[PDB]
Design a protein around this ligand. Structure first.
Ligand SMILES: Cc1cc2nc3c(=O)[nH]c(=O)nc-3n(C[C@H](O)[C@H](O)[C@H](O)COP(=O)(O)OP(=O)(O)OC[C@H]3O[C@@H](n4cnc5c(N)ncnc54)[C@H](O)[C@@H]3O)c2cc1C
Ligand SMILES: Cc1cc2nc3c(=O)[nH]c(=O)nc-3n(C[C@H](O)[C@H](O)[C@H](O)COP(=O)(O)OP(=O)(O)OC[C@H]3O[C@@H](n4cnc5c(N)ncnc54)[C@H](O)[C@@H]3O)c2cc1C
Lengths: 391, 391
């Protein structure tokens, strides 16, 4: 077969690019390793920036989101006996964040694409990339057991952290920066009504906790657990017990507990690759960078990469200005690093670290006391949380 | 002999307290270990906050300062090829910092006191503190070779980091927080005209540099050097060579070099003791805390401690409300920690650290790119640099 742009990975980064492109006339083919329902099984992301929200509207898939998504004007941070709120609306120039599950986002983009008649080959195993540096690159894969050859102009590797794309670039060409945090995130999704109309982040001597939501009758809770901990040791009972222990008395007494729909441990990591392209392969999403969930940026950065890529590809296809694709990584990384600095910061001021002396602990507490009490300090968090502008 | 308040250490913290108190009627005696000219030999501090400036005016010693001190509306930070200025005036609500040497400050307070006829016993060796917890505490010392006994109501330990005061409190009662940075500051005072009307802080791959001034015809320059480095290995020649290497081309070509008047290595450290008192002994200045010079806070924190102490002592002597001295450490530490968090921050974003991976370096650069480009981020530095409000 043949096409214009070939997309690797049918996750949010890929389907968002496939949709944007289809809607602009630029044909594309999406290849996925797993089954639609497995892709749909990932709970993952819940907090979206405004830039992403508008982007979904330009992709024409926002009906459901605008009906079920909860718009949030501010968040909360709890530490040392007191709960402190951040009014994101006034402090950010009028911006806000939308709460709407990644599972939903994917479900929506997936229906959108199914309707469009655009190509989507799931269960596409043994994906290999070829001739990235030549005028004609190609992607070969196995369907059941036959080798098929897809011919394209540009390959867009949106296949996640563990994808084949980043592996397909010569190791010497890529410089990697990575930081692994000595803790994990035990996520728990319940079909209970959330404990607060807004999110609560809590720093406690036992560790980090977070109180999220998916809707009015569905909640998402996290606690900080060591990397040697296995999900099976964590029953529903003990999770609730632990969470309650890590939150404010007034917040724990309101909490409505209940059976888990999903439970799992997300290991934290920071990762950035430089650059983000090789010949005709451009990486987008987790295929290029990972940020600790603390900041709610992964999906939101994937959107900015994708936005830049669609925009640059349009300029190259219709406007015949293919030279512009060279400044991809330059544009993206700019936003990526700033996001990463906030994600690392959020993570370092809310999590308890192993083997921390008395001085750093005092600095952490003060980091919170200052940034949550200074009007200039609240702002820095506010504008970073709603998200910095796409360049 | 006998008195009301006895002050240990005739440095800026002590003479500022002795002056404030004398001017309010509360008699005090100052004991110093060294000679006036040795105390006068310390180059140390050069940047003063507005709170301190007004405090000197209330102490009546500000004629000279208001004539020779240079008022600064903004500073500069240089990193990665570009120089970035921070307009402290607009960004801080209209505040600014004054450039005036500590040697001068001390010279001024010393003349002030000499004129006042108030007691000052230099070369007071073998100082020992007694009965801190009783109604009557006392301080004994040797003058030439005779043991003298000074009787007082309250002892004010303003004797610096290595003073006898902090040593005189039961170790179990004090909790210490300390951080030693793996680098030092090679200071150089020249009688040459400064390279910029405002201060330049520079982060460079060789290390930190800083371009200060004492007046229009006197400059103070610093470079970052390892702790194993001795001042004698650092000749004038090589210092200038090194400095030039660490600064912007456009700034290095304007630089007027010249012979050193003073040269020495200041080792960086962070130190806070909790609490700051014991019975009738209250610590103030470096006797209670040390902050890395990067932020220009040591002297300025000593002033806030002193201000609080004078104020509380007045309330106790004339107003007969001695119960109020119990909230000393509570009030002080509040400001102290916030200052320390900024001092540590300044130090971590401008200095090159040994054994830093690729990720932290990228985070440092981004820390600078964000805070120096965000209007909310510039503000956080601005208000912290001019100094937070005395409570
Ligand atoms: C617990 C958790 C919470 C989070 N919360 C937030 C939040 O609130 N807000 C936020 O903004 N971010 C958050 N994030 C991040 C966000 O989930 C991810 O950034 C996002 O899933 C990445 O989108 P992507 O399309 O690049 O990657 P992916 O979601 O990784 O999907 C990539 C697809 O590629 C497929 N694939 C892999 N290899 C191949 C191959 N060889 N060929 C073909 N297909 C392949 C995979 O099966 C997968 O389907 C969170 C992450 C976690 C773990
Ligand atoms: C290179 C450098 C640059 C700096 N720059 C700045 C700046 O720009 N701005 C700023 O705000 N801060 C700065 N600081 C800090 C500032 O210099 C100090 O915080 C300040 O000197 C402390 O005042 P003090 O009165 O507590 O201590 P001290 O200056 O330490 O004086 C204490 C006195 O106690 C005496 N003494 C000691 N033991 C005894 C004893 N047993 N009995 C009697 N006397 C005793 C000592 O001889 C000394 O005279 C800088 C510091 C350094 C090292």
């Amino acid at each position: 077969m043949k096409t214009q742009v070939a997309i690797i990975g049918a996750g949010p980064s890929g389907l968002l690019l496939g949709q944007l492109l289809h809607k602009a006339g630029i044909d594309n083919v999406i290849l996925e390793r797993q089954t639609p329902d497995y892709v749909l099984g990932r709970i993952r992301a819940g907090v979206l920036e405004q830039g992403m929200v508008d982007l979904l509207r330009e992709a024409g898939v926002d009906r459901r989101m605008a009906r079920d998504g909860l718009v949030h004007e501010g968040v909360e941070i709890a530490f040392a006996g007191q709960r402190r709120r951040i009014d994101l609306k006034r402090l950010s120039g009028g911006k806000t964040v939308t709460v709407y599950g990644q599972t939903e986002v994917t479900r929506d983009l997936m229906e959108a694409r199914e309707a469009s008649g655009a190509t989507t080959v799931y269960q596409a195993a043994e994906v290999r990339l070829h001739d990235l540096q030549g005028e004609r690159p190609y992607v070969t894969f196995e369907r059941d057991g036959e080798r098929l050859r897809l011919d394209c102009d540009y390959i867009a590797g949106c296949d996640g952290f563990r994808g084949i794309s980043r592996q397909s670039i010569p190791a010497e060409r890529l410089k990697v920066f990575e930081r692994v945090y000595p803790f994990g995130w035990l996520g728990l999704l319940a079909d209970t009504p959330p404990v607060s109309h807004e999110l609560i982040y809590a720093n406690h001597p036992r560790g980090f906790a977070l109180c999220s939501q998916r809707s009015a009758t569905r909640s998402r809770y996290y606690v900080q657990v060591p990397l040697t901990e296995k999900v099976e040791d964590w029953s529903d009972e003990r999770f609730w017990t632990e969470l309650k222990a890590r939150l404010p008395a007034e917040v724990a007494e309101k909490l409505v507990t209940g059976p888990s729909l999903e439970k799992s441990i997300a290991p934290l990591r920071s990762f950035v690759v430089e650059p983000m392209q090789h010949g005709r392969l451009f990486l987008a999403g987790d295929a290029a960078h990972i940020v600790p969930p603390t900041g709610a940026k992964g999906l939101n950065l994937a959107a900015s990469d994708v936005s830049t890529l669609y925009r640059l590809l349009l300029k190259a296809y219709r406007e015949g200005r293919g030279e512009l694709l060279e400044r991809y990584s330059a544009i993206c990384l700019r936003r990526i690093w700033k996001a990463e600095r906030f994600s690392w910061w959020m993570t370092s001021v809310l999590h308890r670290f192993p083997d921390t002396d008395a001085f750093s602990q005092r600095i952490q507490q003060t980091e919170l006391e200052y940034y949550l009490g200074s009007e200039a300090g609240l702002a820095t968090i506010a504008e970073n949380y709603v998200g910095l502008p796409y360049e």
